[PDB]
Design a protein around this ligand. Structure first.
Ligand SMILES: CC1(C)C[C@]1(C)NC(=O)c1cc2cccn2cn1
Ligand code: NI
Length: 305
């Protein structure tokens, strides 16, 4: 049978709920704001996307987070993965209270933009997404990741006229004629860094377990470990630390963070963008906001854009 994208009222038996306030999580500010490039609003207030070889559709009310999975309702083990994915153990109301008390700009700006939090993405999925995010906007990166999973990744399921695929493994990305195939999709110079980084993680280090070890390791050790890989610079390493390897203190610094820091906080380097000045600006926000520095940065990004 031809399968369709599910809404809450259409097939209500297949939906399971999680008790989650709207102030703790807003899906329309988190799922397509540069963190993850896998979610699309197919029908109004209904975001569909892949999570480790399984398609989901997500929606919410003022007090509930309704979710469904495609193959019956989601299991208690599958509801545990979404609780870890959104990181609902971390209370967002305590952080917004902490940031607002120690920052006047945040107190005014973060009124309208509640429920902005960091996702807990897969390190492999997160790493190769931001390697091909070199001077490209959200629409361009979302196209690259979709075509990347279509060609290399395994086919999962079709809903309406959209074929969903899982994310490619390290073996597929580190193939024999992979660079030629990746260049055909429209990667450019980034295609070489995907093949090189895939060979480094799989062959030399071990596999996906090496990136899982960095999640347990410290922030300085994790960031330095990512920078050794080919293609991963300083800014992309901080993105992966914040979004995958459980480093809330990590602050990705680029030209847009310079604009906010300069205009809204009056910041300057003690000496334009540079390795020393960007490192200083990351520490400035860690000193202001505290251990959840990158989470506060996500709120300003949502409010600015
Ligand atoms: C999407 C895009 C063009 C690649 C850019 C420039 N976005 C980000 O790097 C970024 C960083 C970040 C830190 C906390 C939340 N964030 C959300 N998006
Ligand atoms: Ni100035």
């Amino acid at each position: 049978s031809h399968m369709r994208h599910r809404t809450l009222s259409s097939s209500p038996a297949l939906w399971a709920s999680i008790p989650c306030p709207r102030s703790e999580l807003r899906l329309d500010l988190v799922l397509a704001s540069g963190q993850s490039f896998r979610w699309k609003e197919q029908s109004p207030a209904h975001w569909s996307g892949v999570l480790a070889d399984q398609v989901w559709t997500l929606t919410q009310t003022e007090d509930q987070l309704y979710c469904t999975v495609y193959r019956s309702r989601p299991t208690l083990e599958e509801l545990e993965t979404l609780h870890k994915y959104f990181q609902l153990d971390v209370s967002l109301a305590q952080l917004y209270s902490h940031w607002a008390s120690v920052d006047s700009h945040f107190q005014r700006v973060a009124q309208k933009f509640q429920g902005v939090r960091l996702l807990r993405q897969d390190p492999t999925e997160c790493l190769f997404s931001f390697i091909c995010s070199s001077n490209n906007n959200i629409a361009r990166i979302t196209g690259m990741v979709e075509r990347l999973c279509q060609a290399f990744g395994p086919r999962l399921i079709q809903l309406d006229d959209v074929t969903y695929h899982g994310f490619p493994n390290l073996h597929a990305l580190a193939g024999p004629e992979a660079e030629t195939h990746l260049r055909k999709l429209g990667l450019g110079y980034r295609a070489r860094y995907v093949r090189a980084s895939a060979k480094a993680i799989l062959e030399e280090q071990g596999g996906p377990a090496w990136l899982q070890q960095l999640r347990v390791a410290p922030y300085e050790e994790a960031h330095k470990a990512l920078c050794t890989l080919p293609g991963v610079g300083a800014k992309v390493a901080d993105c992966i630390c914040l979004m995958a390897l459980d480093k809330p203190q990590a602050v990705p610094v680029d030209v847009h963070v310079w604009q906010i820091a300069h205009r809204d906080y009056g910041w300057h380097p003690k000496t334009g963008p540079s390795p020393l000045a960007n490192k200083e600006l990351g520490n400035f926000f860690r000193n202001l906001w505290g251990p959840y520095a990158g989470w506060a940065q996500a709120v300003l990004f949502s409010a600015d854009l």
